[PDB]
Amino acid sequence: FEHATTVPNVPGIPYKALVERAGYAPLNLEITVVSSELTPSTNKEYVTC
Amino acid sequence: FEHATTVPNVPGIPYKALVERAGYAPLNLEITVVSSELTPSTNKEYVTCRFHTVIPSPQVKCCGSLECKASSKADYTCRVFGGVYPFMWGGAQCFCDSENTQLSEAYVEFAPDCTIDHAVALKVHTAALKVGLRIVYGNTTAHLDTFVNGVTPGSSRDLKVIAGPISAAFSPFDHKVVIRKGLVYNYDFPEYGAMKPGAFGDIQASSLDATDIVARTDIRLLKPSVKNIHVPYTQAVSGYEMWKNNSGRPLQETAPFGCKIEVEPLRASNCAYGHIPISIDIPDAAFVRSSESPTILEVSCTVADCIYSADFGGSLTLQYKADREGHCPVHSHSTTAVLKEATTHVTAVGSITLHFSTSSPQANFIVSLCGKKTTCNAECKPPADHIIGEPHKVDQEFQAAVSKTSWNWLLALFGGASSLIVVGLIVLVCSSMLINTRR
Amino acid sequence: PTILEVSCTVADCIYSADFGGSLTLQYKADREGHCPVHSHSTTAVLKEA
Numbered sequence: 001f002e003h004a005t006t007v008p009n010v011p012g013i014p015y016k017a018l019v020e021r022a023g024y025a026p027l028n029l030e031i032t033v034v035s036s037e038l039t040p041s042t043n044k045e046y047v048t049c
Numbered sequence: 050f051e052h053a054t055t056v057p058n059v060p061g062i063p064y065k066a067l068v069e070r071a072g073y074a075p076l077n078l079e080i081t082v083v084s085s086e087l088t089p090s091t092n093k094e095y096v097t098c099r100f101h102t103v104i105p106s107p108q109v110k111c112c113g114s115l116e117c118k119a120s121s122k123a124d125y126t127c128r129v130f131g132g133v134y135p136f137m138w139g140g141a142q143c144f145c146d147s148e149n150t151q152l153s154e155a156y157v158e159f160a161p162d163c164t165i166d167h168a169v170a171l172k173v174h175t176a177a178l179k180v181g182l183r184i185v186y187g188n189t190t191a192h193l194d195t196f197v198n199g200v201t202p203g204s205s206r207d208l209k210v211i212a213g214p215i216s217a218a219f220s221p222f223d224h225k226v227v228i229r230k231g232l233v234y235n236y237d238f239p240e241y242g243a244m245k246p247g248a249f250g251d252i253q254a255s256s257l258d259a260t261d262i263v264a265r266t267d268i269r270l271l272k273p274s275v276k277n278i279h280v281p282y283t284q285a286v287s288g289y290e291m292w293k294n295n296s297g298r299p300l301q302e303t304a305p306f307g308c309k310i311e312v313e314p315l316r317a318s319n320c321a322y323g324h325i326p327i328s329i330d331i332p333d334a335a336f337v338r339s340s341e342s343p344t345i346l347e348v349s350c351t352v353a354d355c356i357y358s359a360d361f362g363g364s365l366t367l368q369y370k371a372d373r374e375g376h377c378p379v380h381s382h383s384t385t386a387v388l389k390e391a392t393t394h395v396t397a398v399g400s401i402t403l404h405f406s407t408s409s410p411q412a413n414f415i416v417s418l419c420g421k422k423t424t425c426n427a428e429c430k431p432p433a434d435h436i437i438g439e440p441h442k443v444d445q446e447f448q449a450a451v452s453k454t455s456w457n458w459l460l461a462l463f464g465g466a467s468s469l470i471v472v473g474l475i476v477l478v479c480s481s482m483l484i485n486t487r488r
Numbered sequence: 489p490t491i492l493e494v495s496c497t498v499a500d501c502i503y504s505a506d507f508g509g510s511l512t513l514q515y516k517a518d519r520e521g522h523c524p525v526h527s528h529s530t531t532a533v534l535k536e537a
Contacts, residue, residue, distance in 0.1 A: 001433055016537055018526035021433065022354040023362045023404070025490070028524040028537040351492075366490055366518070400518050402490050 007031040050336075053328040056080045058180075058215065060319040062442055065387055067380035067417060068186075068331065074342030075420040076335060077378035077391045080327060081183045083192070087308065087317040089176035089222050095241050095253035097170065098163035099287045100264055107280050108152040109135060111143035115152035122156035123252060123264040129153075130270075135278035142278060153270045153280040163257055168229040168289065170238040170250060171315065176220040180325070184208065185391075187335045188376075197325050207334065212327035219322045221304035222315070232299040233310050236292075244288075251288030321440075343375035343395050348421045352405075352412045355429040359441040361389045361404040362432060365425055367418060368400040379403060382422070383414030385449040387442055395419065406442050409449035428453060489521035507535045 003019045010033060017029045056064045059082070066078040100123070108115060117127040133151035135142050143149050159167075178197045184190065186208075195203035197213030204210065223235040227249070236249065244251050246267035254262035268284040301310040308320035348369040356362030363386075371377075377395045381388045386407035393401045395418070407414065412427040451459065493516040502508030509532075517523075527534050 016526055016533060018524060018528070020354055022356040022364060022430070023358070023360055025364075026524045026526075028526060030537060366492065368492060400492050402518060 003029065005031070007033065009033060009036065011035060050333060051328055051330045052078070053326065054078075054080075055216075055324045055326045056082070056212075057444075058082055058085065058323055058325050059321045059440060060085050062440060065380055065391065067378060067382070067420075069420065070336065072339065073333065073336035074339050075378055075417070076187050076331070077185075077380060078329065078331070079185045079391055080329075081185075082180055082325075083183045084181040085178060085308075085318060085320050086180070087176050087178040087220060087320050088314055089173035089220065091171040091173050091315055093255070094170040094172055094238070095250065095255060096163075096167050096257055097250045097253050098167035098289050099160045100157040100252040100266060100289070101160040102155065102266075102268070102282065102284065103158050104155050104280055104282050107135075107154065107278065109133070109143060109150075109278075110152070111145045111149050114150050117152060117154075120156070121261070123158070123254075123262045124266050124268055125154075125156040126268050126270065127152060127154040128270050130272050133273050134276075135273065136276045137278055151273055151278075151280075153273065153282075155268050155270060155280065155282050157252055157262075157264045157266055157268070159252070159254070159257055159262065166230065167257060168227050168249075168292075170225070170227050173220070173222045173224060173226060173315075176222065176317075178213075178215060178320075180212075182210065184210065184329070186329075186331050187378075189335055199326075207332040209330045210327065211330075212325050215325055216323035219306065219320075221300060221306070221308055221310070221317050221320070226300070226315075228312055228315065229293075229296075229299075231312055233301055233312065233315070234296055235300050236296070246288070247285035247291060248288040249292035251285070343371055343373045343377050343419055345369045345371040345377070345395065345419050345421050348418050348423055350416055350423040350425040352425045352427040355405070355407070355412045355427050356432050357407050357410055357429045358432040359406070359437050359439055361406040363405040363407060363412065363429060364402060365405060365412070365416070365427075366400055366402045367416065367423070369395065369418060369421075370398050371395045371419075373397065377419035379416070379418050381405065381414055382417055383407075383409075383449075385409045385443055385446045386412070386414035388416070393418075407449075408441065408443050408445045410452035410455075411449070413449075413453060426453075489517055489519050489523050491523065492516040492518065 001021045005017045007015050014030050014032045019027050019029050050070055052068050054066050064080045068076050068078050115129055117129060129150055129152055131150040132147060134149055135151060180197055181194045183192045191205040191208050193203040193205040193210060195210060195212055197215055199213045202209055202211035225237050226233060226235045227238055238250050239245055241253060244253060244265040246265050251266055252264035266284045268282060271281040273279050304310055306320050306322040308317040310317055350367055352365035374396050376392050378392050379388055379390055386405060389404040410429055412425050412429050414425055415422050416425050495514050496511060498511035
């Protein structure tokens with residue numbers, strides 16, 4: 001069983017969700033964004049100084 | 050005490066019931082078809098395989114003549130040929146420029162490997178179904194190999210049980226089938242003695258060890274037309290080969306109802322076709338007198354987050370008040386819902402949570418604990434995963450496949466239409482009275 | 489564990505970025521254990537889980 005939910009992209013916020021795989025009791029779930037690393041694709045156009 | 054019920058024939062899935070013999074304490078009944086062995090009555094028509102061609106050592110009568118004589122060998126064929134003047138490495142094997150004849154001969158024999166790589170054609174007269182039941186009633190439980198005919202009862206310990214016939218006389222085998230090295234193919238093989246050259250069963254016999262083997266391979270002999278002694282036979286490629294290469298998939302992979310196929314003897318196992326009526330003659334020693342069992346003064350139900358699914362996706366909580374502690378049975382009287390738990394040790398007061406499964410989108414099913422009943426009800430959500438590794442436990446009965454909300458809107462629309470027509474008719478009646486009331 | 493009944497009584501609560509709200513839940517439970525707890529409403533989140 002796969003649960004799915006949106007999570008606020010806010011670092012350090014311990015956003016919580018509750019899964020409901022009803023054949024079993026609910027289970028507490030926390031999706032915490034420890035860190036983000038949005039990396040741009042780039043190339044060295046040129047060096048200068 | 051005889052009780053009878055129609056148990057689904059799904060192998061490996063339990064069917065639960067609650068015998069409600071008022072004289073004694075209600076008792077949990079669960080039926081399980083652990084294995085089914087639908088076995089047809091069959092007789093061997095003939096064995097067959099790659100025929101070997103013996104082209105036996107030719108006969109020569111250098112200065113006489115040979116008249117061929119029929120023989121019992123399979124597809125035995127021979128023709129006299131004249132002016133043959135045959136040679137061997139030593140040279141001319143006759144001293145006859147003319148008036149010299151060769152008696153060519155040919156017959157077929159089972160290839161030595163037919164001892165193991167061979168097919169056998171079987172007719173199926175009818176297929177009876179033998180079923181290995183596992184049954185539990187109260188705490189006592191038993192296993193028994195029954196028959197689903199309704200006249201032959203099985204038995205184990207104190208139990209005597211009889212069942213059948215099945216709701217439909219389904220069978221996977223067609224009237225004609227062929228067994229091969231544990232594989233099985235339903236196939237319209239030609240009857241004994243009706244061999245077609247170049248088709249399955251073009252050679253046939255009652256047994257590989259038999260000597261009355263017969264065949265029709267269209268084997269024919271051309272005139273010997275080279276110095277070297279020879280018999281230029283030719284024949285259709287063995288029909289067994291033509292079938293082997295083009296047999297289609299074996300029934301073991303195409304039999305419907307998911308049933309497996311096995312041999313020695315030919316049998317279909319774990320078939321999941323129809324329903325089997327079963328009559329169970331439970332012994333009173335299994336029950337207790339009604340007053341001796343626990344009984345509940347009040348009980349309540351609360352079902353939560355139930356999911357209709359093949360698995361036990363539903364969970365519900367029962368609360369109860371009981372005169373005494375003890376093992377009470379629990380059952381779902383609704384034909385479209387079933388509980389996993391069969392019994393629970395009750396307490397003078399308490400609550401127990403049970404797992405359950407159903408197809409109905411709504412949990413509007415009757416639950417019973419020690420015979421008392423409460424109407425459970427909840428809107429079960431559609432299952433999260435589209436596919437599951439276990440078969441469904443109950444049919445989608447239409448009376449319950451309609452959700453409460455959906456059924457409510459259906460009855461709402463039909464209520465509007467029915468009310469409009471009934472009110473209209475009533476208005477036509479009342480309007481008729483208007484004139485007669487004032488004339 | 490499962491709870492036969494529960495009711496929510498919320499004490500004096502402050503709406504703020506921190507856990508400025510506090511509430512108390514009475515419960516009736518079949519057996520002791522560790523129930524999951526979560527907020528089904530996007531407008532509120534609990535500290536404990």
